[PDB]
């Protein structure tokens, strides 16, 4: 929602959701570079945490 003075107020869920999408996207990207499995495993752990 927009507050007075050109400043917004948001829910925490938005934040959390964004995290997921970001990491998820990165994973889909990383698998297209055939990256070394260490990096993909780290990204999957981060996605699970998100």
């Amino acid at each position: 929602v927009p507050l007075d003075g050109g400043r917004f107020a948001t829910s925490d869920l938005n934040d959390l959701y964004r995290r997921v999408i970001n990491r998820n996207n990165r994973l889909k990207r990383l698998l297209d570079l055939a990256a070394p499995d260490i990096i993909v495993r780290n990204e999957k752990r981060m996605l699970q945490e998100a």
Binding site: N14, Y17, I21, N25
Partner: protein, 86 residues
């Protein structure tokens, strides 16, 4: 209207049945125009229109077009309260 409430696990197919579209980008709204983005968390094409009976572009703006999907936007022209249940 009902007589019981049933709870259970949700299949991937059921979760896809609920949804009205896939959220692809992590964006929310524009920083200049303050309008929802194309596939962000706040998106008109997925979660419905942002004003009562009018597309996002502004082409259709009356209930004489109720229920039509805009050709240029994809935003259905309906009540904005539908953005609270999709």
């Amino acid at each position: 209207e009902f007589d019981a409430i049933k709870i259970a696990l949700a299949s991937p197919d059921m979760i896809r049945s609920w949804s009205f579209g896939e959220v692809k980008k992590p964006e929310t709204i524009n920083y200049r125009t303050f309008k929802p983005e194309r596939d962000g968390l706040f998106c008109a094409r997925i979660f419905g229109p942002v004003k009562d009976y009018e597309c996002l572009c502004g082409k259709y703006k009356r209930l004489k077009h109720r229920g039509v999907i805009c050709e240029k936007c994809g935003v259905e022209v309906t009540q904005t309260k539908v953005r609270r249940e999709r």
